[PDB]
Design a binder for these strands. Structure first.
Ligand SMILES: [Mg+2]
Ligand SMILES: [Mg+2]
Ligand SMILES: [Mg+2]
Ligand SMILES: [Mg+2]
Ligand SMILES: [Mg+2]
Ligand SMILES: [Mg+2]
Ligand SMILES: [Mg+2]
Ligand SMILES: [Mg+2]
Ligand SMILES: [Mg+2]
Ligand SMILES: [Mg+2]
Ligand SMILES: [Mg+2]
Ligand SMILES: [Mg+2]
Ligand SMILES: [Mg+2]
Ligand SMILES: [Mg+2]
Ligand SMILES: [Mg+2]
Ligand SMILES: [Mg+2]
Ligand SMILES: [Mg+2]
Ligand SMILES: [Mg+2]
Ligand SMILES: [Mg+2]
Ligand SMILES: [Mg+2]
Ligand SMILES: [Mg+2]
Ligand SMILES: [Mg+2]
Ligand SMILES: [Mg+2]
Ligand SMILES: [Mg+2]
Ligand SMILES: [Mg+2]
Ligand SMILES: [Mg+2]
Ligand SMILES: [Mg+2]
Ligand SMILES: [Mg+2]
Ligand SMILES: [Mg+2]
Ligand SMILES: [Mg+2]
Ligand SMILES: [Mg+2]
Ligand SMILES: [Mg+2]
Ligand SMILES: [Mg+2]
Ligand SMILES: [Mg+2]
Ligand SMILES: [Mg+2]
Ligand SMILES: [Mg+2]
Ligand SMILES: [Mg+2]
Ligand SMILES: [Mg+2]
Ligand SMILES: [Mg+2]
Ligand SMILES: [Mg+2]
Ligand SMILES: [Mg+2]
Ligand SMILES: [Mg+2]
Lengths: 206, 263, 59, 158
RNA sequence: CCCGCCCCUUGCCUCUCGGCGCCGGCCCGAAGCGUUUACUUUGAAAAAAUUAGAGUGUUCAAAGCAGGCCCGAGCCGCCUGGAUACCGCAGCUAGGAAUAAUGGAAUAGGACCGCGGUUCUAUUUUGUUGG
RNA sequence: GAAACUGCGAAUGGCUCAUUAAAUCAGUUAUGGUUCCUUUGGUCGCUACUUGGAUAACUGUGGUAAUUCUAGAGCUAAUACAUGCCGACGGCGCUGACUCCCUUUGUGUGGGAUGCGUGCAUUUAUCAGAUCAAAACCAACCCGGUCGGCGGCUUUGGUGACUCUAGAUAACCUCGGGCCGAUCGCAGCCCUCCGUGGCGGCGACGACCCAUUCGAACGUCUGCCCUAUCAACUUUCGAUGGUAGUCGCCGUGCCUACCAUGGUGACCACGGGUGACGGGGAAUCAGGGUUCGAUUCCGGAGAGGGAGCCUGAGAAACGGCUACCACAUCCAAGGAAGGCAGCAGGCGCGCAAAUUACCCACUC
């Protein structure tokens, strides 16, 4: 079937080479996965030596990380925004390594408000009266100075990141190959990477 | 043609220090996978039926081994193509005799009966020192043995004497200039001497010099040195000749002048 | 069908794990002893070094 | 080198992190970007233009992810027309035995030149090391550039 | 034709940690290596079989790797071989410096703790943590 | 102890030389860029006195011209198929109701229920990866001791070189799609005690991971017969390089997207021929050479010609399967079955090459 052999190529001089043998099995095919977004399905391929290998199709949940905070959570993947290799991989919402994805951003908000005792980007406060000010402004006399005042000074999320938390989504990069592992892990963009990718996105579409 | 691993060995392609004929048949024992390499081992059938003449065919050595008589390094081996190798101990207690496979002088194994008190330990060369999970130091010797928790001052190329019954490294000799050694590969396969030098070529094949007990010098690669003593004093018992390699002229003079024909 | 030999096999299978745990315990103990023994000689090397260092830094 | 972002993806060294820190640890003089580099060994010295300067080359020997092992050859530069890739020529003599005489022969090698070296021009002598296949016809990397011969880089006043 | 003296004759060094003198002090071997190569000599590493070659009365030889002794058998045996050479060219290694290549400062800079100025900085000790 | 289920082997060996001209192959090196059934050595604890249903053989009824075709009916097992606990945790860190002296408080002090996670293997991210040459002030602290300050410590392993090995943190789990034994054989002991509460050795088998062995694959340098009546070749039908990915056991235009315009040649590239498989080797030979190597050892390739796959550690397998082409066999014309360049034997081709023998006694 499909083959990865070197012997169908021209040699460096531009000359043809003639084959000496039929196609082997250590030179195999196995067409692409083309992971979409949706309810999970994962098939399993038997490869050289045994060693099953998981090929994902329609993943919808990932394990992403925030490196400044060292805080990693399970999250939902919403959409793909950028793709350095092709552009038809954003029209079809296929999810490959080094893609740029939107995630749900909620568990990071939960951990942040719980760890710092301080809010994210919030517009108005009425929902904070029955609940959430319960977490953020917890009724305790011990700790609530000594601990959380050492949590403060450090709780200075940058302009772009705190602007992200308002619309309820983030920008993340996949750092794992879902076609080989069946997992869509990665890390949320920050700093100059975030600026570069935001400018690229703004420049491409529209 | 060759889609997998092979399992036959032709008599003409077998190692030469087995000292086989060329008229018995097209095939050779083909030692089974073990702790010693294929070209550097000596199967059980060849040691029993060819060097010891205890057996006369392959059936006889099979039915000698199938009676739990032969012990290699303490344990009872039932296979007749087991790859016994350097510094091993054979034990046949039905007759009360123990041997030790060591190259004599001419690049082949000898028959080297030893005392039963000496057939308890064996010397092993260290090839690898790595750390496992939870920071436990391991060893790897020249015969695939793995030792956990060695004292953290034994390194590569050093020799360790181990108890055959329990493992449990007992003592060790250090690779240094001045230590007795036997060469276990190449052209000087069998000669014994002191180190006196170690040339170093970063990236490939650091060579080592040797000078035996008669002022003759010869070099080898570091991959073939085997420290067997502190210096001028072996830890295992040496065979007859003691790796001296007297030349063909001296060979002829000693064979003629002694008139070694019979008793 | 349950038979005394099945229970004997199970007893063997549990005693093996017990023996393995005892082996690990005592081996780790002895190696920690030996490592602590080596650290004293390392201290001795370092103190000899510092002593001769100050010796030759005198003049 | 003011802007090394020329391709459609963010070029950056792996194993390097843009961390959480305070205001004005530097607004110019400390831009919070360290440099990964390794020593090749075998006596070859890492050039300072790889430690100081900034560029993204995963295939460089000194800062990228590649290991030099095996053979070490040398040659003279013949062509510099590809991106980070040059063509060097090795001449030698082949001894025919019927006659007792030699004959001149040559081989060409495509080799990888890191942006660490910026002084190379046709005619220099170049040392190379052996790496894993880096492309269809590239297996070597330039370790060292030298030019200490006649008709030197310029008039000899050094 | 290996040690060293007219200038040098492995040889300049720069220090440093490991073992070596001697009456805290005194000193040479250890680190770079002699611009490089070709050449030449030497080591290492290269399956066997075949080829050359050592031993051995297959009844001789072609072959083969064998075989030789002493006891009436009362030894429940002993001795001994299965060598060695060659294996170009290319790659590795260390001596030699004739021959043949290649190179050095002409609009200079080699050298000495020579200094002068500006400028970056390693992060050790001042006991430690920090301005 | 027949048969049948199960496990393993059938990828070795044997045969032939059609293809193949930097291809194979040879010497040399590299996997710090990969996989590896088995062997040997390490690893094995974070209804349980033992769970479920359901197929063979066997019994019985059949169908078709025909095959190592196979349907319906009735039973019964597992080291087949599928589930799944028990123990011994007396396990630390993060939480922080509350709580204790004097500085309220912050902080200089000491307990703490409560909850969460807590083995190795997978995936992503992050942290540390320790010892340089000396002193002077100021805010706070250990010790030589004192109620404002002087002398004095800084701690896995290895390589020429790793983004190595090991360690710490936050999560993730792939189940039907990791591990942590519901398996079989020999021979035995104490019971605050009357068969069980208990425990005791020796094996077989199985199994995640690491190392070893046997390899396999992909790479480095050098080496090739004749031909110019072959002088320019290669390139969206990848040609040479760059960045991101897909796929693959892994490195890599291996393949895709976007860029650059490169790469080889008179030192013979590119094209053509070979009654060309390569080598160790054979004949001849004063010295140099010339010719041969289908052929018993090593390597490669193929099973009429191409192509595509299943099982498996390992095959693009032909003593395996599925199609097309070329041949050719039986038919009850509906259908079924095939691959001797294995050993004998036969036809054809030719100037040209042996018995349709006996045996596993030797070598394996
Ligand atoms: Mg072919
Ligand atoms: Mg496996
Ligand atoms: Mg075969
Ligand atoms: Mg075998
Ligand atoms: Mg001969
Ligand atoms: Mg003869
Ligand atoms: Mg040579
Ligand atoms: Mg030389
Ligand atoms: Mg039976
Ligand atoms: Mg088996
Ligand atoms: Mg099989
Ligand atoms: Mg034939
Ligand atoms: Mg051709
Ligand atoms: Mg080549
Ligand atoms: Mg080869
Ligand atoms: Mg080769
Ligand atoms: Mg095992
Ligand atoms: Mg039924
Ligand atoms: Mg590319
Ligand atoms: Mg890539
Ligand atoms: Mg062009
Ligand atoms: Mg051609
Ligand atoms: Mg052709
Ligand atoms: Mg042909
Ligand atoms: Mg030929
Ligand atoms: Mg001649
Ligand atoms: Mg041939
Ligand atoms: Mg032919
Ligand atoms: Mg024939
Ligand atoms: Mg080969
Ligand atoms: Mg085939
Ligand atoms: Mg045919
Ligand atoms: Mg199998
Ligand atoms: Mg086939
Ligand atoms: Mg076959
Ligand atoms: Mg069939
Ligand atoms: Mg057939
Ligand atoms: Mg036939
Ligand atoms: Mg005729
Ligand atoms: Mg004839
Ligand atoms: Mg005829
Ligand atoms: Mg037989």
């Amino acid at each position: 079937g499909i083959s990865r052999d070197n012997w169908h190529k021209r040699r460096k001089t531009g000359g043809k080479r003639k084959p000496y043998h039929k196609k082997r099995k250590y030179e195999l095919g196995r067409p692409a996965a083309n992971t979409k977004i949706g309810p999970r399905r994962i098939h399993t391929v038997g490869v050289r030596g045994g060693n099953k290998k998981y090929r994902a199709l329609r993943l919808d949940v990932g394990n992403f990380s925030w490196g400044s905070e060292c805080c990693t959570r399970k999250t939902r993947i919403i959409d793909v925004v950028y793709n350095a290799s092709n552009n038809e991989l954003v029209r079809t919402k296929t999810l490959v390594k080094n893609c740029i994805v939107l995630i749900d951003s909620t568990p990071y908000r939960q951990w942040y408000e719980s760890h710092y005792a301080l809010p994210l980007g919030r517009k108005k406060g009425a929902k904070l009266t029955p609940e959430e000010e319960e977490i953020l402004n917890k009724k305790r006399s011990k700790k609530i100075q000594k601990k959380y005042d050492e949590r403060k000074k450090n709780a200075k999320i940058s302009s772009l990141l705190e602007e992200q938390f308002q619309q309820g989504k983030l920008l993340a990069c996949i750092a794992s190959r879902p076609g080989q592992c069946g997992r869509a892990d990665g890390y949320v963009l920050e700093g100059k990477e975030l600026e570069f990718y935001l400018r690229k996105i703004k420049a491409r579409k529209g | 043609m060759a889609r997998g691993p092979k399992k036959h060995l032709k008599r003409v392609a077998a190692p030469k220090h087995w000292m086989l004929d060329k008229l018995t048949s097209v095939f050779a024992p083909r030692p089974s996978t073990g702790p010693h390499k294929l070209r550097e081992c000596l199967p059980l059938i060849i040691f029993l039926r060819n060097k010891l003449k205890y057996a006369l065919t392959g059936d006889e050595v099979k039915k000698i081994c199938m009676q739990r008589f032969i012990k290699i390094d303490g344990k009872v081996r039932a296979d007749i193509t087991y790859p016994a190798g350097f510094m091993d101990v054979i034990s046949i207690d039905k007759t009360g005799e123990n041997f030790r496979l060591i190259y004599d002088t001419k690049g082949r194994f000898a028959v080297h009966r030893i005392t039963p008190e000496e057939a308890k330990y064996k010397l092993c060369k260290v090839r690898k020192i790595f750390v496992g999970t939870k920071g436990i130091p391991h060893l790897v010797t020249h015969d695939a043995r793995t030792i956990r928790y060695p004292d953290p001052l034994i390194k590569m190329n050093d020799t360790i004497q181990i108890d055959l019954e329990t493992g449990k490294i007992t003592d060790f000799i250090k690779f240094d200039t001045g230590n007795l050694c036997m060469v276990t590969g190449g052209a000087n396969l069998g000669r014994i001497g002191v180190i006196t030098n170690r040339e170093r070529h970063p990236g490939s094949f650091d060579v080592v010099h040797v000078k035996d007990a008669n002022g003759n010098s010869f070099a080898t690669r570091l991959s073939n040195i085997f420290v067997i003593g502190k210096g001028n004093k072996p830890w295992i018992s040496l065979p007859r000749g003691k790796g001296i390699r007297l030349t063909i002229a001296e060979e002829r003079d000693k064979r003629l002048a002694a008139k070694q024909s019979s008793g | 069908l349950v038979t005394p030999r099945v229970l004997q096999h199970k007893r063997r299978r549990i005693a093996l794990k017990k023996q393995r745990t005892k082996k690990n315990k005592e081996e780790a103990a002895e190696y920690a002893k030996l490592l602590a023994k080596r650290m004293k000689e390392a201290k001795e090397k370092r103190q000899e070094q510092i002593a001769k260092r100050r010796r030759l830094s005198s003049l | 080198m003011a802007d090394i972002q020329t391709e459609r993806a963010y070029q950056k060294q792996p194993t390097i992190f843009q961390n959480k820190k305070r205001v004005l640890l530097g607004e110019t003089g400390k831009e919070k970007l360290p440099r990964y580099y390794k020593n090749i060994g075998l006596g070859f010295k890492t050039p300072k233009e790889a430690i100081e300067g900034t560029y993204i080359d995963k295939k460089c020997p000194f800062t990228g992810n590649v290991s030099i092992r095996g053979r070490i050859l040398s040659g003279v530069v013949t062509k510099m027309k590809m991106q980070r890739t040059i063509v060097i020529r090795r001449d030698y003599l082949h001894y025919i035995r019927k006659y007792n005489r030699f004959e001149k022969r040559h081989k060409n090698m495509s080799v990888h030149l890191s942006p660490c070296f910026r002084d190379v021009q046709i005619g220099d002598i170049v040392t190379v090391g052996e790496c894993r296949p880096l492309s269809k016809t590239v297996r070597f990397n330039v370790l060292k550039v030298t030019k200490a011969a006649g008709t030197k880089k310029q008039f000899q006043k050094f």
